[PDB]
Design a protein around this ligand. Sequence first.
Ligand SMILES: COc1cc([C@@H]2c3cc4c(cc3[C@H](Sc3nnc[nH]3)[C@@H]3COC(=O)[C@H]23)OCO4)cc(OC)c1OC
Ligand SMILES: Nc1nc2c(ncn2[C@@H]2O[C@H](COP(=O)(O)OP(=O)(O)OP(=O)(O)O)[C@@H](O)[C@H]2O)c(=O)[nH]1
Ligand SMILES: Nc1ncnc2c1ncn2[C@@H]1O[C@H](COP(=O)(O)OP(=O)(O)CP(=O)(O)O)[C@@H](O)[C@H]1O
Ligand SMILES: Nc1nc2c(ncn2[C@@H]2O[C@H](COP(=O)(O)OP(=O)(O)O)[C@@H](O)[C@H]2O)c(=O)[nH]1
Ligand SMILES: [Ca+2]
Ligand SMILES: [Mg+2]
Ligand SMILES: [Mg+2]
Ligand SMILES: [Mg+2]
Ligand SMILES: [Mg+2]
Ligand code: NA
Lengths: 439, 423, 34, 312
Amino acid sequence: MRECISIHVGQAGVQIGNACWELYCLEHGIQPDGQMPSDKTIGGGDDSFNTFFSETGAGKHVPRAVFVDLEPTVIDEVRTGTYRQLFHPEQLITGKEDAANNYARGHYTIGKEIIDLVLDRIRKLADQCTGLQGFLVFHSFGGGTGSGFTSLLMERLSVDYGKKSKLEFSIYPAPQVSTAVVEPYNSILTTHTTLEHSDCAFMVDNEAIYDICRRNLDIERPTYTNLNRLISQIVSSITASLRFDGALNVDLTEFQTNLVPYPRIHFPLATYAPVISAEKAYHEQLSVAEITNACFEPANQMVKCDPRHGKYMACCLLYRGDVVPKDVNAAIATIKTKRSIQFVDWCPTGFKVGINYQPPTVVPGGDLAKVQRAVCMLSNTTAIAEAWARLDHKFDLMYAKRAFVHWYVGEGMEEGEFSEAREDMAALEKDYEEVGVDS
Amino acid sequence: REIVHIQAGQCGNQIGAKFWEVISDEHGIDPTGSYHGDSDLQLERINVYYNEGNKYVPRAILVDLEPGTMDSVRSGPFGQIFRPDNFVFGQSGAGNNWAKGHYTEGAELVDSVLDVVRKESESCDCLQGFQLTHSLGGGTGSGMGTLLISKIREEYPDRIMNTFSVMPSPKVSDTVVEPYNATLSVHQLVENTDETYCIDNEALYDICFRTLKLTTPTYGDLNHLVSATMSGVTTCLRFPGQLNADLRKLAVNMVPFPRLHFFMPGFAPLTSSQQYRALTVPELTQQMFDSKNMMAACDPRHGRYLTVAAIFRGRMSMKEVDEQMLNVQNKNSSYFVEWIPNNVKTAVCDIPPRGLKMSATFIGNSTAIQELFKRISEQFTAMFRRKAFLHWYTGEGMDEMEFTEAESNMNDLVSEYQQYQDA
Amino acid sequence: MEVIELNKCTSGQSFEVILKPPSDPSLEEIQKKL
Amino acid sequence: MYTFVVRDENSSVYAEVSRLLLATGQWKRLRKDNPRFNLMLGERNRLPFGRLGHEPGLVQLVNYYRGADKLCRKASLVKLIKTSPELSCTWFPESYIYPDEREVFLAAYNGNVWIAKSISSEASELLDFIHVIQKYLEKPLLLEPGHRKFDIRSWVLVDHLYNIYLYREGVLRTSSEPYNSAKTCHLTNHCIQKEYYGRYEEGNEMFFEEFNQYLMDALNTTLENSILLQIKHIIRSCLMCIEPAISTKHLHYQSFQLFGFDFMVDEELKVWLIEVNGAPACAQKLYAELCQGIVDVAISSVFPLASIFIKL
Ligand SMILES: COc1cc([C@@H]2c3cc4c(cc3[C@H](Sc3nnc[nH]3)[C@@H]3COC(=O)[C@H]23)OCO4)cc(OC)c1OC
Ligand SMILES: Nc1nc2c(ncn2[C@@H]2O[C@H](COP(=O)(O)OP(=O)(O)OP(=O)(O)O)[C@@H](O)[C@H]2O)c(=O)[nH]1
Ligand SMILES: Nc1ncnc2c1ncn2[C@@H]1O[C@H](COP(=O)(O)OP(=O)(O)CP(=O)(O)O)[C@@H](O)[C@H]1O
Ligand SMILES: Nc1nc2c(ncn2[C@@H]2O[C@H](COP(=O)(O)OP(=O)(O)O)[C@@H](O)[C@H]2O)c(=O)[nH]1
Ligand SMILES: [Ca+2]
Ligand SMILES: [Mg+2]
Ligand SMILES: [Mg+2]
Ligand SMILES: [Mg+2]
Ligand SMILES: [Mg+2]
Ligand code: NA
């Protein structure tokens, strides 16, 4: 067994991290006080769920998790929440005043002050690990902390843990879900600074989550709780293979091996189905063919884009519930003859498939209904570059007038870092075009 | 994240005391400082404006160079609630003279004020910055107030400075020297504030006369408008919710270039109350953005919105708010700049003000504000070309050169706003 | 359409299905920037 | 009140379309780069499809199908017709390379005239002028009097539901020069005919009413039976083939697009697809009617206000 440490930075990373660990405890039968009746080895073990939980002599299962926010109000709702007893004080880290939606303030001004503390508290978790695999980092692209401090931390994690893998779950900004006007700046700045320190990054576009919440849960104006509980379902689908018995994506290195042939093109598209309203009394249970077909519907993707106008490098299908290989291959054969599914020429046209028989867990009283089967598709397609092009375009509009730039220079950042960052994203966009388009 | 409020001069302390009456009510604080409210959103962020026998005390400093108006605050409805040591006043007055407030009378009193500021700042767990109420047309709020702002910046250079600045108008004038005092003050604000709400007495008078059909508006009528605006514009600072704003995020998001930090507020429904028909969300959005509803006498259709922040208060359809807000931009896209994407943001708060089941308040950084600085510049120039009334200022040690430089800096400001109306 | 590397356990199974074959800054440099 | 933008000033057809939108008082034109639009009349090249459909509270529609170029450029169309199981045929001339299928072109070369574009009887002459080599139709149907050649242009509208609408009015673009099989009586391009005309029909443009009468008098058949059935067959085959690749059915933005199909007719009244055009112009006589039909079925179907087409 090899351990994974989760790190949650800024408001989005913390509040999403709250939802995930709530879900993880439900999936594993761990009560809010940290007790786990199913676990018969008291105070130790190297089961699969021990990758994410350590154990005390008292029998308490403790998340290998750190929560970090440069303001105390969000983390305080963990301290005093439903799982207070799960975490211990050392894992919740709050500063005094936040980064004010400003990457440069989160990265340079406040980050300097707090990085050594955060690294020290992570070291206390790494020391309890007999074989640390690396880190899962949850954060927004857009926040001052989520963008500015995350990038400083990722740089320092590559220093202090050079051999360890680092995975990201990144919340990509969408005006429908309250955004700062400078979020394009923050997004580009932090992608540039984090690009070479992350081995695999799952972008989640708030616009996509928001619309799924409106369309499939028929919530008229979804809350952060609605958004985060759906996001946590997808995150849990992605991390299940680390926490349960299985042979696919069983450690962080396999994510890179299976999803990322080229280190810079390391942003897989996630597509999830089905998402069913819980106040919908009687709903037909979707079949393997249907939920697999729904994986090629842009309306189910975590980032809206058109994979038909791009090329695939890698594709993993992650099923939960009543699913057998026979049905998967039937559904795939059908889909190959009707969908437009082009792989690059230097890659096998195929699917790695993982099945966990336990159907998804939902939060009692949440807006998602139990289903008897679901699937998360992870595909590395060049079509996700549409998300970069969109963001890059908004950055250009504002930067052409140097709008807001003075806030960043006033924190000690050189204007040249904007151009550095933007030029990196320009290369990134052209790497995608080289890989996935022909003239 | 505590705010320290300072109110200076006659106007400053009058609209200041109304602000505290209004929000004290909204948070359930009675004149004696004891909380007797019925909801817990009221107390959740109460410490932003109040210090804590479980009584709440405004973190407010009351400043004036003559004792009159502050005797009136101490006798007013909520007068008991202010900390007695936070009244800081002299005897001489400022004679509606910027130089007296800034250089002679005010200089004598400013260190006493900073001692009270310092004491309030020390009892702060994490000081956000300062909020000052004042007019620009008099002597104490204008001259001493900008002197305070400068001294505060020097002692707290990493904190935010926010002002509600009442701009003078010939339609509601006390003295002819108001353009001089206002021009000298704007120069101070361009340099030493991060955010200034322009509260234009011309716009308030027009609104009282035309819309509210009050034919003889008093300062009490004008101040009813300012009170409603100050409450709405501070809502997201004082109440918990979706979006918990603060002074620094305000400035980062609304100010694309450091000198263009002068905002036009807007409010709906405009009231003198007397009406029980609550407005539909479409109507709030329509009126709020109507020129006849903005507290600065500027035509937004003569300029462009750089940034806009709107807050809707009461119980109403979030879905309908977003629809109407998006409607207004998508129907007049010409009045929003292309080079700041998604520059209109909207918040909601369930807790309506008093006497209203729903309201809307608008914060706008519009290039049309240049019209207000032009108006002042014209009035300034009409007198200054003849050096009229200047002896009031040279008698206090000032030289004409200082007026010339202030005129120049304000014309520069007008130019800069026009530069981005044509971008 | 080939099915390879099939692994089964009590919790589920995994496999691969093939449809067609194919044709760092230092601690000091950080501290300086900060 | 709907909003739209105009990013192709050279568009004859959508210049008329926008002027009709304005003349309803319910459509407002914004500046080119304003993102807050309902309708985009996009540019011909590098239209930014990835930025469409991301504006909150805006249903967005664009007048091009992303991916349609595969039908609408001659190399792509030959490849498309050759590798698509649903066409790869009979109504497309044997077509074939870069300056591959060079060995294969010479293998069939063993009437042996061909044409290159992107006309000779000797392969050597054109391989060194070099692109696609297409079998030249040596036995066209010749209009008389005039012993002359022609091509048929059909306008086809595909709406956001991927319904296919064939405009009632075609146009024959005719050669005004008798056909000599031993390059102007061979190219019916109108710009080539009014530069190297006006003889028999105004503009070397014969419309359907007259051409049908001609077939009735000269051949005892109709335009519908002898030609249009094949035309409708071909339009459906091409567009239904590419439908899964370009359909905006479940997309975050919607497309429609106007196409111009160019057909040849041979001596036995068989119809041949020559090419498909993704940015066609119209016949002046027909602009009013067709641009109004575009607004009715392509634009107001998505954005309603307060048939000239055959449904294929
Ligand atoms: C002082 O009251 C408000 C301030 C803002 C304001 C604010 C003001 C803006 C703006 C953005 C934003 C951002 S919004 C955000 N949501 N998530 C991150 N950032 C931030 C947040 O905190 C803030 O303080 C910023 O764009 C133009 O004007 C906004 C308001 O309503 C929308 C408030 O009432 C009108
Ligand atoms: N999905 C989701 N998005 C969130 C959540 N909270 C904030 N966001 C998004 O995150 C971005 C804002 O960054 P935040 O994480 O809130 O800000 P922060 O990291 O705390 O940084 P500062 O407050 O500036 O110090 C915006 O795009 C929000 O829409 C959340 O709980 N869930
Ligand atoms: N195999 C073929 N057989 C007979 N005539 C042909 C032919 N290919 C082309 N032509 C003639 O050439 C003329 C136009 O050729 P083509 O359609 O290939 O290029 P084009 O000028 O139309 C490019 P576009 O219209 O897409 O801008 C046709 O009208 C036709 O008379
Ligand atoms: N809106 C409003 N304006 C005021 C009020 N009192 C004075 N003014 C204006 O303030 C300016 C005069 O300044 P004032 O505050 O009285 O002088 P000060 O005491 O020296 O600061 C003039 O432009 C007046 O119109 C008030 O209560 N409300
Ligand atoms: Ca155990
Ligand atoms: Mg935060
Ligand atoms: Mg181990
Ligand atoms: Mg006075
Ligand atoms: Mg043509
Ligand atoms: Na004195």
